Amino acid sequence: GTSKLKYVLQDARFFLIKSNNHENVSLAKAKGVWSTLPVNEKKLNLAFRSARSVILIFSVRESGKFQGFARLSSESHHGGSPIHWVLPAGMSAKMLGGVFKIDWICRRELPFTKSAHLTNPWNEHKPVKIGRDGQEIELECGTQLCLLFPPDESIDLYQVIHKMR
């Protein structure tokens, strides 16, 4: 069904995450974590305090697809176990901010060809696939995008619902 999913997404905020590579999304899927540049870390922390759910929707650059979506379960925090992210030519690990804990809602991919009817008002009504890392996606667009993903029957949203407060 889709009823618990719709409940989790009700009044949520949504952010597009553009990963440079598949490895970092693989790490995020395995460890339930994400880290971003301080400019986006501050925005995500503000949103986490401000909304019942904050959803990250992931896309690996040049893949032509989204790789899934997840809900923040914490603000960013430092001092945890290190994560060996793959970072660009000349960027150090301390350039990233703290670590956000995330609960995956869907680990399956969605090709951009299937979201071509969805535009994001907060990015000039461009197709939702278009945007910089951290671009916020307006509520209706983000909800419809998340509902397009194939169902992930490995997921149980019961425990996610209990975290909402």
Ligand SMILES: CNC(=O)c1n[nH]c2c1CCC2
């Ligand atoms: C896991 N997080 C990342 O891979 C990331 N987030 N922001 C930026 C990067 C690399 C380049 C800038």
